[PDB]
Design an enzyme around this catalytic site. Structure first.
Site, PDB file in Angstrom:
ATOM      1  N   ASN A 155      -2.501  -5.786   7.196  1.00 43.34           N
ATOM      2  CA  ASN A 155      -1.175  -5.210   7.246  1.00 43.34           C
ATOM      3  C   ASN A 155      -1.121  -3.834   6.543  1.00 43.34           C
ATOM      4  OD1 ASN A 155       1.679  -4.777   7.125  1.00 43.34           O
ATOM      5  ND2 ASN A 155       2.030  -6.976   7.070  1.00 43.34           N
ATOM      6  N   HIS A 184       0.797  -1.208   0.000  1.00 41.36           N
ATOM      7  CA  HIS A 184       0.000   0.000   0.000  1.00 41.36           C
ATOM      8  C   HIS A 184       0.848   1.286   0.000  1.00 41.36           C
ATOM      9  CE1 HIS A 184      -3.796   2.236   0.677  1.00 41.36           C
ATOM     10  NE2 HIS A 184      -3.027   3.043   1.384  1.00 41.36           N
ATOM     11  N   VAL A 220       1.454  -2.118   5.619  1.00 40.84           N
ATOM     12  CA  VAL A 220       2.379  -2.077   4.467  1.00 40.84           C
ATOM     13  C   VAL A 220       1.997  -3.008   3.306  1.00 40.84           C
ATOM     14  CG1 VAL A 220       4.248  -1.249   5.956  1.00 40.84           C
ATOM     15  CG2 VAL A 220       4.170  -3.658   5.358  1.00 40.84           C
ATOM     16  N   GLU A 221       0.895  -3.750   3.444  1.00 44.16           N
ATOM     17  CA  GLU A 221       0.434  -4.665   2.399  1.00 44.16           C
ATOM     18  C   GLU A 221      -0.936  -4.203   1.889  1.00 44.16           C
ATOM     19  OE1 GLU A 221       1.036  -8.690   4.020  1.00 44.16           O
ATOM     20  OE2 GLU A 221       3.175  -8.342   4.134  1.00 44.16           O
ATOM     21  N   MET A 222      -2.013  -4.870   2.311  1.00 40.71           N
ATOM     22  CA  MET A 222      -3.338  -4.508   1.794  1.00 40.71           C
ATOM     23  C   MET A 222      -4.025  -3.326   2.503  1.00 40.71           C
ATOM     24  SD  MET A 222      -4.378  -8.389   0.510  1.00 40.71           S
ATOM     25  CE  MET A 222      -5.529  -8.026  -0.803  1.00 40.71           C
TER      26      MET A 222
END
Ligand code: HEC
Ligand code: HEC
Ligand code: HEC
Ligand code: HEC
Ligand SMILES: [Ca+2]
Ligand SMILES: [Ca+2]
Lengths: 323, 323
Positions: free
Chosen positions: B111, B71, B113-115
Site C-alpha cells: 500500500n 509513508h 499510503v502505508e508501507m
C-alpha cells in the site's frame, strides 16, 4: 598478557545493571512509569511518535535511518544515537547540550521536527488519564504537582538509566576470559589502541566523555561533515568549537548503522577509515581496517529484554491527535 | 439465570490461547519469526513503519488516530482496527477483501499510503540478513523457497493468530462468574441483545462475521459515512454493496477509540447512539446508552504480554531507506 593489561588501563566493562543515579536508588515506581512514557506515542502532538520510534529497542536502540523522521515526515539534521548505555555518557546529544537524560528528554517532546508537543499539552494528556495520575502520584510522593513535565522527564530518565548492554565479548574479555575475543578481534583491539583511537574512545562507553573536532588532523568530505551543522559552536559560541562533536560512544556500533552525526556512512569499514584519516592522519591498511571492524563487533552487548508496556486508554478529556 | 442463558446462546468466550489454525498446529518457529516481522520497520520502504506502528500492541492493537498515518505522513481513508482476535473474523479489513491474516498481510506492505514497498524489496531485505535466511529455512522447512513473500505473510499470520484477549469481565461472566459483570453491565447486556445489536454483533468476537449497510434503516450522518468510501462496492462493483461494511467485532472496543471505518467518533456513547439510529431506527434513551457503554467496557480482555523482539542487524546488501 600485555594486550590485556593495555586494554584494562583504558576501558571498563558495562555493569550488569544500574540501580542508582546521582547517589540514590532508582525508584522502581519511577522506572515502570518511565517505561510507559518511553513507548507512549501520545507524548507527541500527532500521537504517532514515541521515543521508541526513533530509538527502537529491537534494532540497537536507534532507528537506523540517516536522519530521524519526525512530525509531518520532517527529517532532522542528525542521526539518532542509541539510548542504550546513555547514562554513562558525560553529557547528552551529539553536542553535549544536555547534562543528563532528565534534561535530554525535554528536547524531543518540544522539538517541532520530532515530537512537536509542549509541556502544557503533555501535562494535559497525562492528567486526563486516571492510571497516569495514580502512577505519577505514587512515583513522586512528595510532589504537590506529581503530574508534570519535569517529573515526566525524571521518570523517563529512571527508565533509560536501566537500559544497559553488559557482557559483550569485549567485556567478558576485560573481566577475565581471554578467549572471548577471537584472534582477529585481538589484532583489531591492538590496532585500535596503538593507532590512538582510544585517546577519544575510552572508558565504559569507548567515547561519550569529551568533545573533539571532527577532523583533528583533516576535515572529512562535505557529505560526512555537512557545513550547516557546526556541532558544539551552537552550544558554546566559542569559535574553536565549530565542527567539534562529542566522541561517539562505540558500544553496540555494529547495530546502529549508519554512522556519524550525519548518518551518511553505511559501512563500518568506511567509518573506521574516515576516522583514521580525519582524526589520526593515518590511512589504515586493509588489514587494520577489517581487524578494527571485527573488534568493534565485540562491542555489541546483551540487548535489554523489553516487555511492551500496557498503556492506559484515553478518556474524554485526553487531547486529540493534531498537526 | 435467564439473562445468562440468553447471553450463552449468542456469545462465546475468547479461548485462553490459539495453538492451531486451519486444522494444523502453529509452529513456534513461524510464530517467533512472525513476531520479528510484525515489529521490523525494514519491511516498509522508508524503514520507519512496522505493523506495530499502526497496530500498536500497547494501545489495544490499534493506533487510535482517526485514520492511519503512513509513508510520507500520508493519511489513509480508514481507521485501523485491532489485530487482536482478528483470527476469528470471517474476513479481514472493513470491506472483507482479504480472506485471512496471511492474505491480509501482503496488503499493507504494498500500500502506497502505508508501507509503500514490494514483494521484491521485501525478499531482497530478508535475504540480505543471515539470521532471517536461517530463520525462514527452519520455519519453512518444506518450502522450495523458504525466504519468500508468501512465507513472510504466513509467518505474520501465525504470530497474529496468537494475539488474543481472554478473560474480559464479559468472558468471566459467560464462563460462570455471575458477579464479573456489575448491575449496570448486566442491564447494558440486556439492552444490547433486546434492541437487536446482537443480530449483527455476535459470536466469539461480537461482530466480524458478516456485512451490513452502514444505515440499514436510516443513513448515518455523512461525517461518519464520507461519500468517497463506498465499502464493499469497491470490492464487488455491486451497487447494493454501496456503503456495506463488515459488522465491527466489539472485543476491546473501549481501548480502540475513535470509532467506525472513518474514525470521526471518539465517544462510545455517541457510537452506540449512531448504531441505534442507523441500524435499528431507534433513538435509544440516554440511560440505555450509558448501560450499553458500560457493557461494552466489559469486553476488554487481558492484553497480550509482548516481549519486544531482537531484530538482526542490516548488512551491506540490505536495501537502504527511500521513497
Ligand atoms: C522521548 C521523550 C525520547 C527520548 C527519551 C529520547 N529520544 Fe531522541 N534523538 C533523536 C535524534 C535525531 C537525536 C540526536 C539529535 C542531536 O544530537 O541533536 C536524539 C538524541 C537522544 C539522546 C542522546 C543520547 C546520546 O548518546 O547522545 C537520548 C538519550 C534520547 N534522544 C532519548 C531522535 C528522536 C526522535 C525523532 C523523530 C524522537 C521521537 C525521539 N528522539 C524521542 C526521544
Ligand atoms: C578524537 C581526536 C578521535 C579519535 C583519535 C578517533 N575518534 Fe572516532 N569519533 C570521534 C568523534 C568526535 C566522533 C563523532 C564525529 C561525528 O561528528 O559524527 C567519532 C565517531 C566515530 C565512529 C562512528 C560512531 C557512530 O556513528 O556511532 C566510529 C565508528 C569511530 N569514531 C571509530 C574510530 C576509530 C576506528 C578510530 C581510530 C582509527 C577513531 N574513531 C579515532 C573522536 C575520535
Ligand atoms: C498504517 C501506516 C498501517 C500499517 C503500517 C499497517 N496497518 Fe494494518 N491496517 C491499517 C488500516 C488503515 C487498516 C484498515 C484498512 C481497510 O481498508 O480495512 C488495517 C487493517 C489491518 C488488519 C485488519 C483487521 C480487521 O479487523 O479487519 C489487519 C489484521 C492488519 N491491518 C494487520 C497488519 C499487519 C500484519 C501489518 C504489517 C505488515 C500492518 N497491518 C501494517 C493500517 C496500517
Ligand atoms: C447490522 C444491521 C447492525 C446492527 C443491528 C448493529 N450494528 Fe454495530 N456495526 C455494524 C456495522 C456494519 C459496523 C461498522 C460500520 C462502519 O462502517 O464503520 C458496526 C460498528 C459498530 C461499532 C464501532 C466499533 C469500532 O469502530 O471499533 C460499534 C460501537 C457498534 N457497531 C455497536 C453497536 C450497537 C451498540 C448496536 C445496538 C444499538 C449495534 N451496533 C447494532 C452492524 C450492526
Ligand atoms: Ca547510527
Ligand atoms: Ca478504532
Amino acid at each position: 598478557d600485555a594486550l590485556h593489561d593495555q586494554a584494562s588501563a583504558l576501558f571498563k566493562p558495562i555493569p550488569e545493571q544500574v540501580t542508582e543515579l546521582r547517589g540514590q536508588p532508582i525508584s522502581e515506581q519511577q522506572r515502570e512509569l518511565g517505561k510507559k512514557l518511553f513507548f507512549d506515542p501520545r507524548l507527541s502532538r500527532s500521537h504517532v511518535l514515541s521515543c521508541n520510534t526513533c530509538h527502537n529497542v529491537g534494532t540497537g536502540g536507534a532507528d537506523n535511518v540517516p536522519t530521524s523522521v519526525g512530525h509531518g515526515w520532517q527529517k532532522g539534521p542528525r542521526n539518532s544515537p542509541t539510548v542504550f548505555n546513555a547514562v554513562f555518557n558525560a553529557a547528552q546529544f551529539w553536542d553535549g547540550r544536555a547534562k543528563d537524560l532528565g534534561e535530554q528528554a525535554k528536547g524531543p517532546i518540544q522539538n517541532s521536527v520530532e515530537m512537536h508537543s509542549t509541556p502544557q499539552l503533555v501535562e494535559q494528556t497525562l492528567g486526563s488519564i486516571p492510571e497516569y495520575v495514580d502512577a505519577f502520584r505514587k512515583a513522586f510522593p512528595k510532589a504537590g504537582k506529581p503530574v508534570s513535565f519535569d517529573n515526566m522527564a525524571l521518570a523517563i530518565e529512571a527508565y533509560e538509566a536501566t537500559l544497559v548492554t553488559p557482557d559483550s565479548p569485549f567485556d567478558l574479555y576485560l573481566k577475565g576470559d581471554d578467549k572471548a575475543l577471537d584472534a582477529q578481534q585481538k589484532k583489531g583491539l591492538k590496532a585500535f589502541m596503538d593507532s590512538g583511537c582510544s585517546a577519544c574512545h575510552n572508558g565504559i562507553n569507548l567515547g561519550g566523555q569529551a568533545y573533539f573536532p571532527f577532523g583533528l588532523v583533516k576535515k572529512p568530505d562535505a557529505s560526512v561533515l555537512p557545513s550547516g551543522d557546526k556541532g558544539r559552536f551552537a552550544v558554546t559560541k566559542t569559535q574553536s568549537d565549530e565542527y567539534v562533536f562529542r566522541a561517539a560512544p562505540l558500544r553496540n556500533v555494529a547495530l546502529t548503522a549508519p554512522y556519524f552525526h550525519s548518518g551518511q556512512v553505511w559501512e563500518l569499514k568506511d567509518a573506521v577509515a574516515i576516522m583514521g584519516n580525519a582524526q589520526l592522519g593515518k590511512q589504515l591498511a586493509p588489514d587494520d581496517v577489517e581487524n578494527i571492524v571485527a573488534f568493534l563487533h565485540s562491542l555489541s552487548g546483551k540487548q535489554p529484554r523489553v516487555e511492551y508496556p500496557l498503556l492506559p486508554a484515553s478518556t474524554e478529556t485526553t487531547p486529540r491527535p493534531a498537526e
